[PDB]
C-alpha cells in the first residue's frame, strides 16, 4: 504494498 507517505 500500500502507498506510503515520504
Amino acid at each position, epitope marked *: *504494498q*500500500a*502507498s*506510503q*507517505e*515520504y
Partner: nanobody, 126 residues
Framework: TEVQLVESGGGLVQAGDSLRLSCAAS????????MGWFRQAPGNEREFVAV????????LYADSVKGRFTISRDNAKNTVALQMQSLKPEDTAVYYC??????????????????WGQGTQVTVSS
C-alpha cells in the same frame, strides 16, 4: 519542456461558496505520477494543499482543508481535480498543480515535484 500542466477553474467567490479547479496534464506518462495541489498567497510561502497517488488509491489533505476539499484524478483524460467547498478568505491564493514521478508514494514536500503548472487565482470575499 515537453511536459505541461495547465490549471483552470479559478475565480472570485463569496465565503461559503464552492469552486472546482482542474489541471490538464500533457507530455508525461500521467499514471506514473503522484499529483499534488499547492497554493501561495501574497507575501507567504507556497504551501501544501492535497496530493493523490498515481493509482488514485490514497489521498492526503492539509489540516486546513480536510473535510472541505476533495482531490481526484482521471487517468484516461490526464486530468486532476480539486473540488473546494465552504471557501473562506484564508483560502485566497494562487493554486498550483504539480507532478511527482513515482508510484505507491506521496509527499507534502515541494522539492520532490518535477513539474509545475503556472497557477490559477482563487479569491474569496468576506
Amino acid at each position: 519542456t515537453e511536459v505541461q500542466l495547465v490549471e483552470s477553474g479559478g475565480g472570485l467567490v463569496q465565503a461559503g461558496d464552492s469552486l472546482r479547479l482542474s489541471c490538464a496534464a500533457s507530455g508525461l506518462t500521467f499514471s506514473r505520477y503522484a499529483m499534488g495541489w499547492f497554493r501561495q498567497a501574497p507575501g507567504n510561502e507556497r504551501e501544501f494543499v492535497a496530493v493523490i497517488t498515481a493509482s488514485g488509491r490514497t489521498t492526503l489533505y492539509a489540516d486546513s482543508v480536510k473535510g472541505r476539499f476533495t482531490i481526484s484524478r482521471d487517468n484516461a483524460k490526464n486530468t486532476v481535480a480539486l473540488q473546494m467547498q465552504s471557501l473562506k478568505p484564508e483560502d485566497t491564493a494562487v493554486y498550483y498543480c504539480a507532478a511527482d514521478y513515482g508510484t505507491s508514494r506521496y509527499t507534502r514536500r515541494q522539492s520532490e515535484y518535477e513539474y509545475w503548472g503556472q497557477g490559477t487565482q482563487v479569491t474569496v470575499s468576506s
